[PDB]
Scaffold this motif. Structure first.
Motif, PDB file in Angstrom:
ATOM      1  N   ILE A 121       5.144  17.465   3.485  1.00 34.87           N
ATOM      2  CA  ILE A 121       6.343  18.061   4.090  1.00 34.87           C
ATOM      3  C   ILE A 121       6.766  17.176   5.307  1.00 34.87           C
ATOM      4  O   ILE A 121       5.920  16.543   5.946  1.00 34.87           O
ATOM      5  N   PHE A 122       8.065  17.108   5.565  1.00 40.42           N
ATOM      6  CA  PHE A 122       8.682  16.218   6.582  1.00 40.42           C
ATOM      7  C   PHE A 122       8.723  14.713   6.252  1.00 40.42           C
ATOM      8  O   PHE A 122       9.349  13.943   6.992  1.00 40.42           O
ATOM      9  N   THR A 123       8.110  14.310   5.132  1.00 40.98           N
ATOM     10  CA  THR A 123       8.091  12.899   4.738  1.00 40.98           C
ATOM     11  C   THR A 123       8.795  12.754   3.416  1.00 40.98           C
ATOM     12  O   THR A 123       8.924  13.740   2.666  1.00 40.98           O
ATOM     13  N   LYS A 124       9.312  11.544   3.173  1.00 41.31           N
ATOM     14  CA  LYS A 124       9.896  11.188   1.885  1.00 41.31           C
ATOM     15  C   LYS A 124       9.409   9.823   1.398  1.00 41.31           C
ATOM     16  O   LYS A 124       9.023   8.954   2.205  1.00 41.31           O
ATOM     17  N   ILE A 125       9.516   9.642   0.083  1.00 38.38           N
ATOM     18  CA  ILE A 125       9.211   8.369  -0.583  1.00 38.38           C
ATOM     19  C   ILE A 125      10.109   7.202  -0.153  1.00 38.38           C
ATOM     20  O   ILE A 125      11.357   7.309  -0.076  1.00 38.38           O
ATOM     21  N   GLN A 126       9.437   6.099   0.144  1.00 39.66           N
ATOM     22  CA  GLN A 126      10.037   4.864   0.608  1.00 39.66           C
ATOM     23  C   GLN A 126       9.215   3.743  -0.054  1.00 39.66           C
ATOM     24  O   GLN A 126       8.467   2.997   0.606  1.00 39.66           O
ATOM     25  N   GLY A 127       9.318   3.663  -1.377  1.00 38.65           N
ATOM     26  CA  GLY A 127       8.605   2.644  -2.133  1.00 38.65           C
ATOM     27  C   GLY A 127       7.165   3.044  -2.424  1.00 38.65           C
ATOM     28  O   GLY A 127       6.803   4.229  -2.417  1.00 38.65           O
ATOM     29  N   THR A 128       6.330   2.044  -2.647  1.00 36.93           N
ATOM     30  CA  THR A 128       4.984   2.283  -3.150  1.00 36.93           C
ATOM     31  C   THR A 128       3.948   1.404  -2.479  1.00 36.93           C
ATOM     32  O   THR A 128       4.268   0.526  -1.662  1.00 36.93           O
ATOM     33  N   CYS A 129       2.693   1.667  -2.814  1.00 32.10           N
ATOM     34  CA  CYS A 129       1.585   0.880  -2.329  1.00 32.10           C
ATOM     35  C   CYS A 129       0.592   0.687  -3.458  1.00 32.10           C
ATOM     36  O   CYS A 129       0.614   1.428  -4.480  1.00 32.10           O
ATOM     37  N   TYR A 130      -0.255  -0.324  -3.264  1.00 29.30           N
ATOM     38  CA  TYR A 130      -1.467  -0.506  -4.085  1.00 29.30           C
ATOM     39  C   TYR A 130      -1.108  -0.756  -5.548  1.00 29.30           C
ATOM     40  O   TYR A 130      -1.446   0.047  -6.435  1.00 29.30           O
ATOM     41  N   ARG A 131      -0.425  -1.891  -5.772  1.00 28.93           N
ATOM     42  CA  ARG A 131       0.097  -2.302  -7.081  1.00 28.93           C
ATOM     43  C   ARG A 131       1.001  -1.215  -7.712  1.00 28.93           C
ATOM     44  O   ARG A 131       1.022  -1.011  -8.934  1.00 28.93           O
ATOM     45  N   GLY A 132       1.782  -0.578  -6.850  1.00 30.24           N
ATOM     46  CA  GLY A 132       2.674   0.532  -7.199  1.00 30.24           C
ATOM     47  C   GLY A 132       2.064   1.856  -7.609  1.00 30.24           C
ATOM     48  O   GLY A 132       2.797   2.743  -8.051  1.00 30.24           O
ATOM     49  N   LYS A 133       0.742   2.017  -7.481  1.00 29.91           N
ATOM     50  CA  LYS A 133       0.069   3.237  -7.948  1.00 29.91           C
ATOM     51  C   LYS A 133       0.148   4.396  -6.929  1.00 29.91           C
ATOM     52  O   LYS A 133      -0.029   5.552  -7.292  1.00 29.91           O
ATOM     53  N   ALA A 134       0.372   4.080  -5.656  1.00 28.52           N
ATOM     54  CA  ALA A 134       0.434   5.093  -4.611  1.00 28.52           C
ATOM     55  C   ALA A 134       1.879   5.181  -4.111  1.00 28.52           C
ATOM     56  O   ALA A 134       2.623   4.222  -4.225  1.00 28.52           O
TER      57      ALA A 134
END
Length: 36
Positions: free
Chosen positions: A19-32
């Motif tokens: 809550i209070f956060t949103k997605i801004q891309g990925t991490c860890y070879r796109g898995k996170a």
């Protein structure tokens, strides 16, 4: 990526973004999500 994420103030997470956060891309070879 992990670097971009943490540099913008976000967190690399293997769940949905907290809550209070949103997605801004990925991490860890796109898995996170980068949540900010």
């Amino acid at each position: 990526d992990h670097y971009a994420c943490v540099s913008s103030g976000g967190q690399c997470l293997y769940s949905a973004c907290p809550i209070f956060t949103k997605i801004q891309g990925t991490c860890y070879r796109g898995k996170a999500k980068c949540c900010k």
